[PDB]
């Protein structure tokens, strides 16, 4: 039961299962993993594909020869297993040069370097098949107020994404960008801190059609936000180009628990939403097996990501299929929410005494929403207590 297969589109970053366990207070607890080993183990577990930062696949500073060798062995593992690479990204955060940012570093020379580093890896991503190129500007931001003029930083951010769009347009590449918001960590505050801020920013780019969001469960939860609601807004905008799935236990450091852990009910509502919306993209896990775990625990945690998605998918489908739930949704007027408020237009509305002058507010107010019965059906379905 709940056995993943490539059909399910589950993907993982090299840096997820490959996390060695270093944290702000801790040295590594596991050895580095060869990307080839990761491709093989994930294929065996039923994954569809793998994603990478440039510097996860090719060690930073590699010579051209060394680079080509790391790429070759990775391609052979992908080719052997049938694993895909639907997304890739750039590491614009680890190297000390990026301490004040990549695209919004105060030093101009750093901004230019960030763009070149990105462009090099776009070319590689395209060859390997990626259709989405993620950008997580984890160093874009500040710890103090005068360090970063945010209006000017947004000018630089826009400039950078507009040039990237000019580059992929001039190359004829198919690939789209997905901007990943995060509220904080490793900067005190990160620019584009939520899905909304990223969506808004995209609308000022030259070619907005080339850009969407890559929201992450835990990131929105680091602002105490409702991740399903934010995904709904991204879907409403036509901008859910990719997603990062994991768990997070509230407002704290980015934990990257396996998917299903953390806010379990939010995981359920997320799966419900992705499945009813027909999201087509990868089901990508950006998670970290806790550093308590050895390599066997790494693979158990990765398998758990997929298993939990599949359990939740089953529960959400059962919920929506249940005639008792379909009736409860009507009792709660979810059908009526879909009716246009005033298709009849402004003049009709203004002349309609049933909308104001003769509207019985007390009788409307007295009508319960029946949301608790509805939500207890959802609870019962999630828990298998039906």
């Amino acid at each position: 039961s709940y056995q993943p297969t490539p059909e399910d589109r589950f993907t993982f970053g090299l840096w997820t299962v490959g996390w060695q366990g270093r944290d702000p207070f801790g040295d590594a607890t596991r050895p580095a993993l060869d990307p080839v080993e990761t491709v093989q183990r994930l294929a065996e577990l039923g994954a569809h594909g793998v994603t990478f930062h440039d510097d996860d696949l090719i060690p930073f500073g590699s010579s051209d020869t060394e680079r080509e060798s790391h790429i070759k062995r990775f391609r052979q593992a992908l080719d052997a297993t049938g694993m895909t690479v639907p997304m890739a990204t750039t590491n614009l955060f680890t190297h000390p040069v990026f301490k004040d940012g990549g695209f919004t570093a105060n030093d101009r020379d750093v901004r230019r370097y960030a763009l070149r580093k990105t462009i090099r890896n776009i070319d590689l991503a395209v060859e390997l098949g990626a259709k989405t190129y993620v950008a997580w500007g984890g160093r874009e931001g500040a710890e103090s107020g005068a360090a970063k003029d945010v209006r000017v930083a947004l000018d630089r951010m826009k400039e950078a994404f507009d040039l990237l769009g000019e580059y992929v347009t001039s190359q004829g590449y198919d690939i789209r960008f997905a901007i990943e918001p995060k509220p904080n960590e490793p900067r005190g505050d990160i620019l584009l801190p939520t899905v909304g801020h990223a969506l808004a920013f995209i609308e000022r780019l030259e070619r907005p059609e080339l850009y969407g969001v890559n929201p992450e469960v835990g990131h929105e939860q680091m602002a105490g936000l409702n991740f399903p609601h934010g995904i709904a807004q991204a879907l409403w905008a036509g901008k859910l180009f990719h997603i990062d799935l994991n768990g997070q236990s509230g407002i704290k450091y980015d934990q990257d628990l396996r998917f299903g852990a953390g806010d379990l009910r939010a995981a359920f509502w997320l799966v419900d939403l992705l499945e009813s919306a027909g999201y087509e993209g990868p089901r990508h896990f950006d998670f970290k097996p806790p550093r308590t775990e050895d390599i066997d625990g790494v693979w158990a945690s990765a398998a758990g990501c997929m298993r939990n998605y599949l359990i939740l998918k089953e529960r959400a489908a059962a919920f929506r299929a249940d005639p008792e739930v379909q009736e409860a949704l009507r009792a709660s007027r979810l059908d009526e929410l879909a009716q246009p408020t005033a298709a009849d237009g402004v003049q009709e509305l203004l002349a309609d005494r049933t909308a104001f002058e003769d509207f019985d507010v007390d009788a409307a107010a007295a009508r319960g929403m029946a949301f608790e019965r509805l939500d207890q059906l959802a609870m019962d379905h999630l828990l298998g207590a039906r």
Copy 2:
């Protein structure tokens, strides 16, 4: 010192100083205030104007005669004092009819009523001089996941704001809308929870030019966000149509402390930003004198809002004017942040070996940002310890 005058554009809602002190666990501690008294007392304190919800100025359910009488006495007080009304709004949250929303209530008849209630008060706002009409959808949202289909709710929200835009266009009115985000409270999660989400939503409206944001200090802080940064993004987008100033002591219920209270350093950076950007709009306080206070404390707290803005304005101007700060900003490369990254374009950048092949990442990395010295100059200026 720090004496406000109408020149300073300070405004207050009737519901701010007029808050009787009811809270989730508490009955009123102060009597209702006559709006006439409020206009007179605020004028005496140096305010520029006053704002209102419909139902603050005219009791809900008033007959047409009663309505006209409340409006008349208010207009006479405004006229006597020279107090202005730069903004008004609708109460779509208190009456039980709005328990599931106004514009996104599941019941269609409620949605229509919300629109009529709004339109009636738009007409009054325009007569009284308001150039901004705020919409805070405090009941739009949910406590449970199936209660609200957020994509469909956003359809209804858009429909509602688009009709309002059609109405003010057809009337020839000058007035613009300002959508006020809030993450939660009184709903478990509110739709459009942050500045970013509101900015993004506006870009899908039919006439986006008619809509901006009304961010509130405490609201963004209820998501742990950096309010100055969010204001910078709103300014960058050209959408800071109005602002609500107050204080908030972290991630908790909406406190509505007087401005300057709560996160004092964020208040400083906010004033610094508004003043350097040349924000033109009202300096509106959406605050509540704590229910510990009697009426004398109400006016003291309102005076404190204005005093703190003026102190911070002085400190921020001194900071920016200090040659030592101008030098520290250069040391931190804030000047260089304003240089275009690659005005020279994509082909130049790609051919520039100083951007990649020959870029000395270690020498760049070793260059400190000098942000701590800069921030300690800012601290010294805020504290008057210069």
Copy 3:
């Protein structure tokens, strides 16, 4: 399935199901409930008993005649249904007199009044059978720093609880006190903000044996804390005299969702802990049916509290009973956690080279904890996916 009966010890406050729906931004959505109706409806749903504040049972300011009448009808309903009253409490928060506190109000006369109000209701609680008397000092605290000298306030708090202990000792009463922490709301910060602070405070009382804690799920979660962990510390201390069960969706205003809602996994671990510890006390729900609901939704939400406890109880028992889980617990060394570290004493430990000089830290470090496999068994059990 999952049908509660009085054997299950579920209790509810009059003020829970009886909440009329007033919130900081909203008028009542439901009529007041007669306490007699509440006793009858809860009995029908399978509850064991009911709790009250003084002013929920007898309207504030009632004459002695009126008081006696409200008590009489309540006692007859209890007697008719076999409903019990295991706990009662005082309302030291609603009336404006308590705006700065009850026991720690700055005004001495208010402190004395708070004590008299409490003592009167202790006598009534004892007659009705309560064995625990809760004290939630919701007004004890501050919005500003100089308003409350916390050391002195703690002196007053101790004085007050010590006198209450002298009173119940002199009366020979059996009843114990349970102090309820909360971090904030309705004060900006509340004194004794968490389980730990309350536990610590109790240890400075004259008769600490008379006092324990009444932790509430949502309250600890308003500080982002792990409620099961805090309950474990209270149990470890022998101080879990009562508990308030509900749900909370993160760090925000006190939501009082039905139990099971909010952090579902924390609800599971809480039930697991209460059941393995053999907690004997009432399973008390301090929750609010959302104001979206009519009276039928009130009773559905109350029934859902009990149903969710019973589902979780079944899942937790299945988890602990599963041989595969018992093996995983051994694999994770939960058995070894129960072995004394050094029963052998200090000199042995210091002479034991296997503890230091000859301890192979790398071989120990390499041993994974197997916590992910364990936690996925727990997930599978919770979801019924076993």
Copy 4:
């Protein structure tokens, strides 16, 4: 102005200014510092002393010869400068062996090793003059619910601290322990998450007099708590043995900003409290110069810690000394808070009709607390706007 001298008791951990800048997403931005260099630079800046973890002073795994050499050079630097060592601690968090804890690791052999590692460094701390030995159990806790039985973990924690107390008693050493709470990070939840939990735990130790707390500004703020209030409770309990001073920008990862940064008003109220209470202990900064900074920024940030304490000390003293503030405190009944509520005892209170029967609750309720005027005097003093 605001020049620190050793008289001011400012101290710093080796690991503070010596932080190389590694974060969860970042490699080091600065070279390791020689502890000798740190002692000399801090002495030049006006510090009083320095603190250390074992493994900051002596690299982990050093031979006995190497150990003795690192100690010798450190002692000579201390002796040359007159720098003191008032506190030391053990690193029970970095090495992978501690991935599930030190004293509460599930593996018994790890628990024993943790104790031996601690005892070795207690002996060194005592020789160097430390009067407080801090214990921050950063690895004690869990990411998942069944991984850690918290009641049993608390048994192990108590066992460990009781043995340490037996050891220092048997050695005749003068030194006391200070337990440092933290809510999370690097564990998902840490045991003893707040000041209150630590205070409560101490009261179950065999020799409670040997143990106090070492609260850290940012740690309590990671739970959204009021740090001054928690310090007041620790002082009330007689348990403020040491303190860690820094800044934190709300509920997020542990930032370790310089003192004064983050919540500036809380820093003011903290200094006000420490100075009025006559806290005698070190003014210890547990902070990290941001990794944006080079070594010159490191020393600027350290100097800023001390400068901000001294500015705030001046402002708080001016506030308390101001006759206008002394009058406002009376207007707010802070004097009356210090009067015993009922020194007259229970029978008097019960017979006193002015406390209940004849208490005019409405006249008391109507009396404003005047807290806003008081708090605006505090604001004016902090800002130097008096």
